[PDB]
């Protein structure tokens, strides 16, 4: 028997604190432990320019 | 790096119950199984002893086996009993009768397949398996017989892991059972072949600890099992917390055992001191070292003053300098040089761990490999020879099915173990 | 300037869903076929035409057909979110599956459905003015993909003739497996694909699982991840038709440059900057690092080791901010390496392409955003090891006729097994002979 | 350069002082926690 | 210009933490890999390049790998303060330790992990244009440091060839000891280290404890103090590559000047103005006082007495406000002394270096701030006494095959003990022969 929706939501809320759910989620890259900023053009060095 | 525990017989199950109380306290797990700790350092190695159950909960990696359910019903009724997985309690329907042959051959072969099935299901779930840890008494009936049977099966199935046993040897002064020498001799025969490292504890040394050091007026078995649980939970501490000089069960074995038969060790834990005196003297490494080597603090009847140390290991918990550890171990080796084996250039290994046991500023656990161990086996061998020459109670065991040649083999093997210790005590350069 | 996509069976339709998601998001077409008012202002452009055609009211509809014998996957497309994007006639579904039987797809059941498929492709091809090839997606492990893919390619090859047909094919991986009868279906498929395909790209799920574990940090991948990687590869190969660049590469140039002899048309594929957001911000990603990456076997999408063979031709496609001089310096450095070997009859081993459009980022996706990428398809003798392992599994089962009564009951002669096995044996001998280190002067 | 060295020494001394203050505060914190644990254990045993 | 750092096991990683703390603080790199102050045109600097490379966003990342077989120390690095500095691929960790067995590290466990390390080193060496050596930190007393350090040095020496390899090595102290089996591991390490290292600098913890008690005012030292001293020494030796100076010294000049014969490459190290902040403002610290200081045995970081041997070469590093004339006057005064003796075949016994950057002060540190410092590395026959005591402890233990069954079970036979002991005996005889005065000139 399932105790409805609130119990299920709290049950899933108590789950993610497990280390397995943190470093091994389903079909996803594990979350970062610090903030990252994606540049406007993307990652990597821009190509260096030269005089015409 | 996770350990699987097995608890067998009454003594083993009670000590295990106190052990899982102590370990659950150190990692802040409620008796409901909920994590309630107060530092991330507690959580980050919880996997070493616990498996994860649904919504929050943690379950302890232990198998309970006994031949009559009385003990199992007592542990289930205890304050932490609920944490244990119901399918992990294994019990029969008739007692061991204090008979090794019954425990090994008749009810043993009946139950043994289900215990191996539980151990394998639990073992194959681990991502990388470290050694097994087993608690049992050698003087009993189901403890000795089924413990050594199980030890043999796990050694067949996992020969590349570590095999560890803690064992409460029979006392010389007050026996609870008449046929203790037979059961002890046969069990030591099984252990010296199968085990990698075995720790031996008397009940008389723990009583003398309680009376002299703690000055307890009326000690009870809960205190004895707490003393055992402190060292048992201490040996594994470097597996599960950070430190300045890490150590490991395999690293302990490599540094302590010079030759493969010499793997029986004594245990001690140092900062035992009564509540009245504690206000007058602070903890420090010289004080810990002094208690650590005092024979008053060793939990085996044999006294170090009658032997020599081959090797010893000290694991320190707390924030302390490594210089003090190194210089203390040098000063103790130089000042007491006759009690240290002269061919090994340095007999003491040290290790340092950041996280002390709760409510103590510092602690050390001591493991010692000492040739005084011969005395304990000698007393039993003597009692065995007195009993065996007269066929004193042998018909029970023969009626279960034992051949007498097993008894003569086990006696010869134990006598050879005593001889090997005696030979290494008296070796010389020439 | 145009290409038509044919999606067959379960793997081909599911990979198609990821492909059309990507092509929509890259051009900017909404899921309902419209295009927002700001994409169509100030300039008038045609680049969509390779994959979409517009109606006179300005709705976009895509140039694809979906073929299946079971309804469920096409019914998922019909009831999903992209319901309004596809024309309903294009989504063709039968009554019952080919049940992992090549014979059921080819002889019994596909014979009923094939004429509707040909009528839809004909109606599409008549409404074109620069059709420049067919793209086909299928798996050779299953019954309908093998049998109906072969039958349809045969009919297409007679009706349209010289026009090129490029296949992306998922072959059975060397130790992960999903069904027992995979060797029989793969051998019988490969017999038909030899005559009726111009280039065949080989994929193994075990390699994409390894790549997703090793480069990305995903422990538990599912088919949507693999299909998004495949979609990125297809977008890289077709980008040369759709966007401006320094060195364009027309689909006929691939066939001209990659195939030395008419049977030697099976190619390996790999993709370089598969990377997570945390690694991507720790590293520069210059041209020479990704060029060195594409030659490591950890980058490949097929489970083969190229160190056990010799390369005949490589085609390297660069997209994004790259300048030709670094590509030339990179290729010269690769050429210097001692663990990379070319057959001595192929001195000028490389083809290059350079396109300015960087790879698109999908909202739910797992790849990082990067300024440049390279994709390689290459012809190498190492592929012969994959066939030898298929032949060993076929020989093991066929020595005792382990399952043959199903195939014989659904309409097939026992002789066809031996014919196909001898043809694939001849293909193995072709790869032995073509790869000869040297010939004697006497 | 005499004054420059003087002011550099001053700022270095200030940074050392703040680091030492943080260390001492942490030490006091852990000491009082341990004392509380010991006290509650003693009280429990006496009551028993 | 570039140098690559390899950290192995526990001592090497913990000393690495102090090294990278110091190098960050000296260049000005924040713990998250950033740069304060301005970045516009007008000024432009490059000194970081020896140890860091920058990304296109301007983050800095360091040229190091951290290698361990147990997770705990690298996980401490991963969760610590420098989390954002290192690339996660650089922090490599196995499952289980080498349990103080050289044999377990070399034969059983390191063979699986070694190929990842070589792949990381290859990826580093490809992102260089003037690599001029490897720096390696390890202890020979433990199992993984000995076994994996030897195996990795062998593989590095085959793959990279002529490139120089400089080791900083902690030997087991002559009476302080931590494990019983230290002599066996140190002999077996030294056998491999003899063939595959260009210069080896020797350290003993007992000397750094004595130096920190006598000169610094620390009653109760711990490993963080020793690691900060080691970091200062390595920073002093590598400063010649990174900053402007009067007399520079390239890493090839060390090998040319310090090593007379190819086996005689083990050197002693010492550092002069180890002084506390309260003493430092009561005293001047001129060049001649610190030059006299570096020759006193109270300054050395190895437990050996140089009066029992002969010097072959000395390399003196001066950093800070020093003038060459004062260095010349100091060296001539040292040369005058009667208790300092050089072999008669080495008349020009000294090499000097002078760099303008004064030593850095670390906020939590225990060293005072000083305007000048000198660091010395020197080659002397006295080192033969250090090996003899390890060999004596080996002979005592080996007489009973005291622990050998562990080593034989994990794969090392028994002959290898005797082989290694004979090689170290020959090294002792080499140091006996080189130090023997020439009998006659004819
Ligand atoms: N990459 C990828 N592989 C798939 C996908 N679906 C199925 N496969 C693989 O392809 C093989 C199965 O082929 P199917 O497509 O199921 O065969 P089928 O075309 O449906 O043929 P029938 O069973 O007769 O309908 C197995 O190896 C699967 O792992 C997918 O969506 N993506
Ligand atoms: N200076 C310094 N010496 C250390 C440190 N840790 C251990 N040592 C010394 O190094 C020797 C022990 O070597 P370890 O580094 O522990 O051996 P290991 O590399 O960990 O090898 P495994 O035990 O197999 O993991 C002893 O002489 C220690 O005194 C440290 O942090 N700093
Ligand atoms: N330390 C300790 N010893 C015990 C405990 N219970 C029993 N013993 C001892 O163990 C021996 C009896 O063995 P027992 O456990 O009954 O054997 P079993 O019948 O096979 O389980 C006697 O020496 C008892 O004194 C206990 O809780 N702690
Ligand atoms: Mg299907
Ligand atoms: Mg270690």
Tokens of E404: 């050998």
Q: Which residue has the tokens 């279906």?
A: C185
**In whole angstroms, what is the distance from residue E12 CA to residue A43 CA?**
33
Q: Which three-class secondary structure state does DSSP give residue B150?
A: helix
Closest CA to B68 of B25, B9, B27: B9
Is B254:E403 a contact under the CB 8 Å cutoff?
A: yes
Closest CA to E220 of B364, D26, B322: B322
Q: What SS3 string covers C386-441?
A: HHHHHHHHHHHHHCCCCCHHHHHHCCCCCHHHHHHHHHHHHHHHHHHHHCCCCCCC
Is C57:C248 a contact under the CB 8 Å cutoff?
A: no
* CA angle (B328, B333, B337) in 5-degree steps: 150
Q: Which residues contact C378 (CB under 8 A, 6 or more apart)?
A: C267, C268, C306, C311, C313, C314, C315
Radius of gyration of chain E (CA): 22
Burial class, E35, CB count within 10 angstroms (exposed 0-12 / middle 13-18 / buried 19+):
middle
Tokens of C29: 């077409």
Burial class, B399, CB count within 10 angstroms (exposed 0-12 / middle 13-18 / buried 19+):
exposed
| E253 catalytic residue (yes or no) | yes
CA distances in angstroms from C101 to B169, C179, C279, listed in the order given = 69, 11, 45
A29 at the E interface (CB within 8 A)?
A: no
Closest CA to B45 of A16, E76, E14: E76
Ligand 1 centre distance from Cα of residue C5 (Å): 18
Instruction: Give the closest of B242, B243, B321 to E222, CB-based.
Output: B321
Is B21:B149 a contact under the CB 8 Å cutoff?
A: no
**In whole angstroms, what is the distance from residue E359 CA to residue E372 CA?**
7
Q: Using the atom order of ligand 2, give the atom closest to the CA of residue B322.
A: 29
List of chain D residues whose C-beta atoms are within 8 Å of the C-beta of residue E371: 5
Determine whether the shortest distance from the Cβ of B99 to ligand 3 is under 6 A. no
Nearest chain A Cα to E81, which residue?
A34
Ligand 1 centre distance from Cα of residue C143 (Å): 9
CA terminus-to-terminus distance, chain B: 45
Strand-pairing partners, residue B267, are: B367
Determine whether the shortest distance from the Cβ of B10 to ligand 3 is under 6 A. yes
**In whole angstroms, what is the distance from residue C215 CA to residue E243 CA?**
38
C224 half-sphere exposure, CB direction, 13 A CA radius: 11
CA distances in angstroms from E75 to B52, B295, E91, E95, E316, listed in the order given = 22, 40, 9, 12, 39
DSSP letters of B288-356? HHHHHH-GGG-SSSS-GGGS-EEEEEEEEESS--HHHHHHHHHHHHHHTGGGB-SSSS--EEEEEES-P
Residues in chain A, total:
52
List of chain C residues whose C-beta atoms are within 8 Å of the C-beta of residue E118: none
Q: Most E CBs within 10 Å: which of D9, D20, D22, as the mutation test of the E interface?
A: D9
DSSP letters of E405-439? HHHHHHT-TTHHHHHHHHHHHHHHHHHHHHTSPPS
Which helix (H) or strand (E) covers residue E237, if one does?
helix E223-242
Is B209:B299 a contact under the CB 8 Å cutoff?
A: yes
Radius of gyration of chain C (CA): 22
C283 at the E interface (CB within 8 A)?
A: yes
E265 half-sphere exposure, CB direction, 13 A CA radius: 21
Q: Which residues contact B72 (CB under 8 A, 6 or more apart)?
A: B13, B64, B66, B89, B91
In this structure, what are the phi and psi dihedrals at residue E292, rounded to the nearest 5 degrees? Answer: -65, -30
Closest CA to C230 of C168, C166, C151: C168
**In whole angstroms, what is the distance from residue B312 CA to residue B252 CA?**
10
Q: Which residues contact D47 (CB under 8 A, 6 or more apart)?
A: none
* Strand pairing class (C60-62; C52-54): antiparallel
Which helix (H) or strand (E) covers residue B164, if one does?
strand B163-168
**What does DSSP assign to residue C243?**
S
Are D and A close enough to touch, i.e. 3+ CB pairs under 8 angstroms? Answer: no
Helix, strand, coil percentages in chain E from 3-state DSSP, rounded to 5: 45, 15, 35
Closest CA to C102 of C145, C156, C155, C152: C145
CA distance D15 to chain B (A): 24
Residues with CB under 5 A from ligand 5 (ion): B 246; E 10, 70, 97
**What does DSSP assign to residue E441?**
-
Q: Tell me how far apart the 2 most distant CA atoms of chain C are, in Å.
A: 73
Which helix (H) or strand (E) covers residue C378, if one does?
strand C372-380
In this structure, what are the phi and psi dihedrals at residue B2, rounded to the nearest 5 degrees? Answer: -110, 140
Tokens of B29: 């797990």
Instruction: Give the closest of A34, A44, A46 to E84, CB-based.
Output: A34
Instruction: Give the closest of A33, A34, A44 to E56, CB-based.
Output: A44
Task: Please state how this structure was obtained.
Answer: cryo-EM
* Strand pairing class (B264-269; B197-201): parallel
**Dihedral angle computed from the Cα positions of residues B39, B45, B51 and B57, in that order, rounded to the nearest 10 degrees:** 10
**Dihedral angle computed from the Cα positions of residues E206, E211, E212 and E216, in that order, rounded to the nearest 10 degrees:** 170
E391 at the B interface (CB within 8 A)?
A: no
Q: Most C CBs within 10 Å: which of E54, E87, E120, E122, as the mutation test of the C interface?
A: E87
Closest C-alpha to ligand 3, atom 18? B140
Chains with ≥3 Cβ pairs under 8 A against A?
Answer: B, C, E
Q: Count of CB atoms within 10 A of residue B370's CB?
A: 24
Is B291:B281 a contact under the CB 8 Å cutoff?
A: no
Which helix (H) or strand (E) covers residue B45, if one does?
none
Ligand 1 centre distance from Cα of residue C14 (Å): 9
**In whole angstroms, what is the distance from residue C300 CA to residue B385 CA?**
73
Nearest chain E Cα to D11, which residue?
E363
Catalytic option among C54, C154, C206, C253: C253
**What does DSSP assign to residue B84?**
S
Q: Count of CB atoms within 10 A of residue C325's CB?
A: 9
DSSP letters of E26-53? HHT--TTS---S--STT----GGGGTEE
**In whole angstroms, what is the distance from residue C24 CA to residue C362 CA?**
11
Q: Using the atom order of ligand 2, give the atom closest to the CA of residue E104.
A: 24
**In whole angstroms, what is the distance from residue C290 CA to residue C288 CA?**
6
Tokens of C224: 């949507």
**In whole angstroms, what is the distance from residue E310 CA to residue E342 CA?**
5
Q: Which three-class secondary structure state does DSSP give residue C372?
A: strand
Q: Most E CBs within 10 Å: which of A23, A33, A36, as the mutation test of the E interface?
A: A33
Closest CA to E114 of E158, E48, E77: E158
CA distance D33 to chain E (A): 24
Burial class, C327, CB count within 10 angstroms (exposed 0-12 / middle 13-18 / buried 19+):
buried
Burial class, B427, CB count within 10 angstroms (exposed 0-12 / middle 13-18 / buried 19+):
exposed
Nearest chain D Cα to E369, which residue?
D9
Q: Do A14 and B52 touch (CB under 8 A)?
A: no
């Amino acid at each position: 028997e399932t105790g409805g929706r609130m119990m299920a939501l709290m049950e899933q809320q108590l789950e993610r604190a497990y280390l397995s759910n943190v470093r091994r989620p389903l079909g996803k890259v594990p979350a970062a432990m610090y903030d990252v900023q994606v540049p406007h053009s993307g990652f990597g060095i821009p190509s260096e320019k030269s005089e015409s | 790096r996770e350990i699987v525990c097995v608890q067998a017989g009454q003594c083993g199950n009670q000590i295990g119950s106190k052990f899982w109380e102590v370990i659950s306290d150190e990692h802040g797990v409620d008796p409901t199984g909920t994590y309630q700790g107060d530092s991330d350092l507690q959580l980050e190695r919880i996997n070493v002893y616990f498996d994860e159950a649904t919504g929050g909960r943690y379950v302890p990696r232990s198998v309970l086996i006994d031949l009559e359910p009385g003990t199992m019903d007592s542990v289930r009724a205890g304050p932490y009993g609920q944490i244990f997985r119901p399918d992990n309690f294994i019990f029969g329907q008739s007692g061991a009768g204090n008979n090794w042959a019954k425990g090994h051959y008749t009810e043993g072969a009946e139950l043994i397949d289900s215990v191996l099935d539980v151990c394998c299901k639990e073992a194959e779930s681990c991502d990388c398996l470290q050694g097994f840890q087993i608690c049992h008494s050698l003087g009993g009936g189901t403890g000795s017989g089924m413990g050594t049977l199980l030890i043999s099966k796990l050694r067949e199935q996992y020969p590349d892991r570590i095999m560890m046993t803690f064992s409460i040897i029979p006392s010389p002064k007050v026996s609870d059972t008449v046929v203790e020498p037979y059961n002890t001799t046969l069990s030591v025969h099984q252990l010296v072949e199968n085990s990698d490292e075995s720790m031996c504890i008397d009940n008389e040394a723990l009583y003398d600890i309680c009376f002299r050091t703690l000055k307890l007026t009326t000690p009870t078995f809960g205190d004895l099992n707490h003393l055992v649980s402190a060292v048992v939970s201490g040996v594994t501490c470097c597996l599960r917390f950070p430190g300045q000089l890490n150590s490991d069960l395999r690293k302990l074995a490599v540094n302590l055992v010079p030759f493969p038969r010499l793997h029986f060790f004594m245990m001690g834990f140092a900062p035992l001191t009564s509540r009245g005196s504690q206000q007058y003297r602070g903890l420090s490494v010289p004080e810990l070292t002094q208690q650590m080597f005092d024979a008053k603090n060793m939990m085996q009847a044999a006294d170090p003053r009658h032997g020599r140390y081959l090797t010893a290991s000290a694991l320190f918990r707390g924030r302390m300098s490594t210089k003090e550890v190194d210089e203390q171990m040098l000063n103790v080796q130089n000042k007491n040089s006759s009690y240290f084996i002269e061919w090994i250039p340095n007999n003491i290994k040290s290790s340092v761990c950041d996280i002390p046991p709760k409510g103590l500023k510092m602690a050390v656990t001591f493991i010692g490999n000492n040739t005084c161990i011969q005395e304990m086996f000698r007393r039993v061998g003597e009692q065995f020879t007195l009993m065996f020459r007269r066929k004193a109670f042998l018909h029970w065991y023969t009626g279960e099915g034992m051949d007498e040649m097993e008894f003569t083999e086990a006696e010869s093997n134990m006598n050879d173990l005593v001889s090997e210790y005696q030979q290494y005590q008296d070796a010389t350069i020439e | 300037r145009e290409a038509i996509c044919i999606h067959i069976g379960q793997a081909g339709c599911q990979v198609g869903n990821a492909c059309w998601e990507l092509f929509c998001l890259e051009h900017g077409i909404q899921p309902d076929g419209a295009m927002p008012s700001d994409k169509t202002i100030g300039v008038e452009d045609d680049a969509f035409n390779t994959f979409f055609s517009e109606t006179g009211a300005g709705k976009h509809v895509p140039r694809a057909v979906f073929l299946d014998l079971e309804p469920t996957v096409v019914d998922e497309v019909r009831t999903g979110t992209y319901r309004q994007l596809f024309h309903p006639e294009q989504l063709i579904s039968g009554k019952e599956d080919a049940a992992n039987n090549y014979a059921r797809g080819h002889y019994t059941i596909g014979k009923e459905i094939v004429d509707l498929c040909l009528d839809r492709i004909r109606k599409l091809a008549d409404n074109c003015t620069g059709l420049q090839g067919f793209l086909v997606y299928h798996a050779v492990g299953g019954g309908t993909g093998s049998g109906l893919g072969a039958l349809l390619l045969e009919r297409l090859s007679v009706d349209y003739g010289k026009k090129s047909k490029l296949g992306y094919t998922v072959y059975p991986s060397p130790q992960v497996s999903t069904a027992v009868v995979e060797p029989y279906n793969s051998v019988l498929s490969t017999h038909s694909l030899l005559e009726h395909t111009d280039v065949a790209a080989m994929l193994d799920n075990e390699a994409i699982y390894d790549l997703t574990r090793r480069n990305l940090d995903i422990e538990r991948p599912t088919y949507t991840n693999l299909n998004r990687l495949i979609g990125q590869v297809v977008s890289s190969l077709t980008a040369s038709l759709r966007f401006d660049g320094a060195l364009n590469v027309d689909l006929t140039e691939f066939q001209t440059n990659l195939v030395p002899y008419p049977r030697i048309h099976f190619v390996l594929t790999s993709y370089a900057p598969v990377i997570s957001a945390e690694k991507a911000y720790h590293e520069q990603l210059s041209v020479s690092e990704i060029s060195n990456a594409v030659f490591e076997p950890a980058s490949m999408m097929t489970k083969c080791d190229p160190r056990h063979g010799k390369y005949m031709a490589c085609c390297l496609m660069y997209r994004g901010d790259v300048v030709p001089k670094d590509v030339n310096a990179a290729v010269a450095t690769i050429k210097t390496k001692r663990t990379i070997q070319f057959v001595d009859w192929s001195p000028t081993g490389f083809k290059c392409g350079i396109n300015y459009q960087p790879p698109t980022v999908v909202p739910g996706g797992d790849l990082a955003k990067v300024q440049r990428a390279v994709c390689m398809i290459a012809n190498s003798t190492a592929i012969a090891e994959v066939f030898a392992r298929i032949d060993h599994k076929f020989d093991l089962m066929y020595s005792k006729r382990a399952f043959v009564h199903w195939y014989v009951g659904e309409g097939m002669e026992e002789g066809e097994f031996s014919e196909a096995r001898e043809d694939l044996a001849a293909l193995e001998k072709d790869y032995e002979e073509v790869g000869a280190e040297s010939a004697d002067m006497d | 350069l005499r004054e420059k060295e003087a002011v550099k020494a001053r700022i270095l001394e200030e940074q050392s002082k703040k680091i030492m203050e943080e260390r001492l505060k942490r030490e006091e914190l852990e000491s009082l926690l341990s004392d509380y644990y010991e006290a509650e254990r003693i009280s429990r045993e006496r009551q028993a």
